[PDB]
Design a protein around this ligand. Structure first.
Ligand SMILES: O=C(NC[C@H]1CCN(C2CC2)C1)C(=O)Nc1ccc(Cl)c(F)c1
Ligand SMILES: *[C@@H]1O[C@H](CO)[C@@H](O)[C@H](O)[C@H]1NC(C)=O
Ligand SMILES: *[C@@H]1O[C@H](CO)[C@@H](O)[C@H](O)[C@H]1NC(C)=O
Ligand SMILES: *[C@@H]1O[C@H](CO)[C@@H](O)[C@H](O)[C@H]1NC(C)=O
Ligand SMILES: *[C@@H]1O[C@H](CO)[C@@H](O)[C@H](O)[C@H]1NC(C)=O
Ligand SMILES: *[C@@H]1O[C@H](CO)[C@@H](O)[C@H](O)[C@H]1NC(C)=O
Ligand SMILES: *[C@@H]1O[C@H](CO)[C@@H](O)[C@H](O)[C@H]1NC(C)=O
Ligand SMILES: *[C@@H]1O[C@H](CO)[C@@H](O)[C@H](O)[C@H]1NC(C)=O
Ligand SMILES: *[C@@H]1O[C@H](CO)[C@@H](O)[C@H](O)[C@H]1NC(C)=O
Ligand SMILES: *[C@@H]1O[C@H](CO)[C@@H](O)[C@H](O)[C@H]1NC(C)=O
Ligand SMILES: *[C@@H]1O[C@H](CO)[C@@H](O)[C@H](O)[C@H]1NC(C)=O
Ligand SMILES: *[C@@H]1O[C@H](CO)[C@@H](O)[C@H](O)[C@H]1NC(C)=O
Length: 339
């Protein structure tokens, strides 16, 4: 017998003890080796209720990533609470690695295995595991990168679709590579991201049809953010330690519903910390070809209000709350206490 409960989890990874890469260094001192032969018991005729939007696991992973960033990515100048903190800003080696989250004795993680599970409600096929799958602490906005893919159909996730204030999580079932590069040899901060239009437009079309099922077949329209900070109005992410802000206006237009989509990007040194502490400044970009090839596995959308009396539903790319990022991976997990 068991019951829903919250306990301090521990992490596990395959980090290299000799790697200077920040993630490997952190997991080396904060995590333990992964289990080569992990056990997984499938519970038959067992119904369990999940709620990705109220999962303490998310808060804990958030706490780790914050700690990891505080120890690895300390800015030269930190502006928070009216206070000004000045420190060293040494360039580091940055590349996220899979992090497993496990439960201690007396506790076990329940995993929903329903192909089209949407994060909330009862789960028919449930199994018990000691640790979650390897999850990369990839911090980004608008587009979810290097995440897990849906096994069957594209899944729309939301704590309450009827409420436009609640962020929407689109879980893709097919990856779409996005190639971002900062050429060496001008503007050392000017960069660009290349996406396969044909591949993207088709996926975006599938996402559209999917949204129709959830919005009574209302016309689905995409539009670029109306306002807000750059971290939200643009696809912000970290590549090789550099903060990239990409203009995603060519991705979210409703005309192509076929060549190579080239997004105008730019590396920023001054960023609005996702930890919600304030502003932080980092050193200028390093030299050489800064390139990161990521797989788009999800999209964060915010729906416009005041469209009740119309047949249109406008969706814009959003983000800001990195917790939603962890939810897109921890949705099928929950901790229970055993007795
Ligand atoms: O500034 C951001 N979000 C708004 C905060 C304010 C207060 N709040 C935190 C209490 C939870 C959300 C942000 O996401 N920055 C950001 C920075 C770097 C990257 Cl690579 C990125 F993808 C996003
Ligand atoms: C999960 O249970 C359903 C019936 O409720 C079954 O059809 C399916 O095969 C099980 N797992 C999957 C997704 O294969
Ligand atoms: C990118 O996605 C592809 C599947 O489309 C996968 O083979 C590859 O391992 C992914 N790379 C990552 C997650 O870094
Ligand atoms: C992705 O999901 C959609 C439904 O949302 C489905 O029509 C499509 O076949 C899926 N694609 C793949 C490659 O499974
Ligand atoms: C998820 O599935 C449950 C099944 O009861 C449903 O009640 C809920 O509306 C779904 N959530 C979304 C975001 O579609
Ligand atoms: C979902 O959002 C709508 C609109 O704000 C609200 O009226 C409704 O109470 C919400 N549903 C739940 C279950 O809270
Ligand atoms: C990524 O884009 C650059 C152009 O900036 C190109 O030279 C490179 O071959 C691309 N990589 C892949 C794997 O498409
Ligand atoms: C773009 O994607 C399509 C499939 O959607 C593929 O057939 C084509 O080879 C891709 N183009 C490039 C330049 O890789
Ligand atoms: C959308 O339209 C299709 C085809 O008429 C219909 O089968 C389906 O019930 C509709 N979905 C809605 C209104 O959610
Ligand atoms: C994104 O780029 C487009 C290019 O037409 C531009 O019009 C728009 O102002 C840009 N948006 C932001 C957030 O700067
Ligand atoms: C929409 O996206 C396509 C991608 O090829 C781009 O060519 C076009 O200029 C965009 N339309 C806009 C920004 O109005
Ligand atoms: C996504 O994964 C690829 C392959 O490991 C990696 O090269 C790239 O840096 C990752 N992208 C981000 C945004 O971390």
């Amino acid at each position: 017998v068991w019951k829903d409960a919250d306990t301090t989890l521990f992490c596990a990874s395959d980090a290299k003890a000799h790697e200077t890469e920040v993630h490997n260094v952190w997991a080396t001192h904060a995590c333990v080796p992964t289990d080569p032969n992990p056990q997984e018991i499938h519970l038959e005729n067992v119904t369990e209720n999940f709620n990705m939007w109220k999962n303490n696991m998310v808060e804990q992973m958030q706490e780790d990533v914050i700690s990891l960033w505080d120890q690895s990515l300390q800015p030269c100048v930190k502006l928070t609470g009216g206070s000004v903190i000045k420190q060293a800003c040494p360039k580091i080696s940055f590349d996220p690695i899979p992090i497993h989250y496990c439960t201690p004795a007396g506790y076990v993680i329940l995993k929903c295995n329903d192909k089209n599970f949407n994060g909330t409600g009862p789960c028919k096929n449930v199994s018990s595991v000691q640790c979650t799958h390897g999850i990369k602490p990839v911090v980004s906005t608008q587009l979810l990168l290097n995440g897990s893919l849906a096994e069957e159909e594209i899944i729309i996730r939301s704590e309450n679709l009827t409420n436009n204030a609640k962020t929407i999580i689109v879980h893709l079932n097919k990856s779409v590579e996005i190639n971002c590069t900062r050429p060496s040899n001008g503007d050392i901060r000017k960069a660009y991201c290349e996406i396969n239009g044909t591949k993207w437009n088709k996926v975006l079309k599938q996402v559209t049809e999917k949204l129709k099922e959830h919005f009574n077949n209302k016309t689905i329209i995409f539009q670029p953010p109306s306002g807000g900070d750059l971290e939200i109005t643009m696809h912000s992410f970290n590549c090789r330690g550099e903060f990239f802000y990409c203009n995603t206006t060519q991705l979210f237009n409703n005309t192509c519903i076929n060549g190579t989509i080239t997004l105008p990007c730019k590396i920023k040194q001054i960023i609005n910390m996702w930890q919600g502490t304030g502003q932080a400044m980092y050193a200028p970009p390093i030299d050489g070809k800064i390139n990161c090839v990521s797989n788009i596995t999800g999209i964060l959308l915010t729906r416009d209000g005041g469209a009740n009396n119309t047949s249109n539903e406008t969706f814009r790319p959003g983000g800001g709350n990195i917790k939603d990022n962890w939810r897109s991976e921890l949705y099928k997990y929950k901790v229970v206490q055993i007795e």
